[PDB]
Amino acid sequence: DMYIERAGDITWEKDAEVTGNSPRLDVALDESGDFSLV
Amino acid sequence: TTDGVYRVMTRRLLGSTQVGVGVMQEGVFHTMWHVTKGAALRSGEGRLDPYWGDVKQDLVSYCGPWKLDAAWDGLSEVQLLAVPPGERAKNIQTLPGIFKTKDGDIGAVALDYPAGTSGSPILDKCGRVIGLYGNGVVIKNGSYVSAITQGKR
Ligand SMILES: N=C(N)N[C@@H]1CCCCNC(=O)[C@H](CCCCN)NC(=O)[C@@H](CCCCN)NC(=O)CNC(=O)CNC(=O)CNC1=O
């Protein structure tokens, strides 16, 4: 058994950190729902 | 059952453990299949039972059909409202990458977070959830790149 606890609202924050790149990858998705790098 | 982002908790480990993230919208709770594996969730004195799921999409709805229909424009920046275990929800702006597959392309965010962060929503500038975070690959640098997982309503 699991339980949920509220973590906040779904809102866009103007003063948000900007980070992370934008890679372009060829990937395969198998029947089990796992992504694979191709 | 109020709208917003919720933590998926469980006392089945050493104690309080956050297994993933979820989004409640229009009375339906949206998380990723691998987080709950369809298990029923407790919302206080009331329970929530799975309504729809697809292991391939790694998504699952509760109390109703999938309600998230917003899509990334493939152009604008978006924000990952990451919810790490024991850490306050933080908005992380970023520009999605591309997962190039045989069935088309999908957005991907190159953000690395604890395993318990699976299911944290990804927002557009308008505030609409355009997908869920937690299902991706690990790139060359040991990085983690999660796909912008979105279902059909
Ligand atoms: N390691 C990183 N740089 N970042 C991940 C972030 C993870 C965020 C939350 N997402 C998940 O938990 C999902 C759940 C399963 C969904 C797929 N059905 N897991 C992953 O996507 C699979 C994908 C591998 C399959 C590729 N074919 N990644 C891995 O396990 C890599 N982790 C390890 O090896 C050891 N674990 C850790 O360190 C803890 N977690 C990480 O650190």
Torsion of CA A24, B133, B29, B10, to 10 degrees: 150
The best mutation among B54, B59, B138, B140 to test binding of ligand 1, ranked by most ligand atoms within 8 Å of the C-beta, falls on B138
The structure tokens listed for B99 are 């997962």
d(CA B11, CA B18): 9
Q: How far is the CA of B24 from the centre of ligand 1 (A)?
A: 24
Q: What's the angle, vertex CA A11, arms to CA B59 and CA B120, rounded to 5?
A: 30
d(CA B13, CA B10): 7
Confirm if B149 and B137 have CB atoms less than 8 A apart: no
d(CA A6, CA A8): 6
The structure tokens listed for B19 are 């297994």
The resolution in Å comes to 2.6
Among B92, B101, B121, beta carbon nearest to A10: B121
Cross-sheet strand order for the sheet of B136-137: A35-37, A24-29, B97-101, B104-109, B145-147, B136-137
**Where are chain A's structural domains?**
1-38
Confirm if B17 and B10 have CB atoms less than 8 A apart: yes
| CA neighbor of B80 nearest in space, from B7, B29, B134, B152 | B134
Q: How far is the CA of B115 from the centre of ligand 1 (A)?
A: 6
Catalytic residue among B61, B118, B120, B146: B118
Confirm if B98 and A25 have CB atoms less than 8 A apart: yes
d(CA B35, CA B150): 15
- What's the burial of B119, exposed, middle or buried (CB within 10 Å: 0-12/13-18/19+)? buried
Q: Which residue has the tokens 């409202």?
A: B81
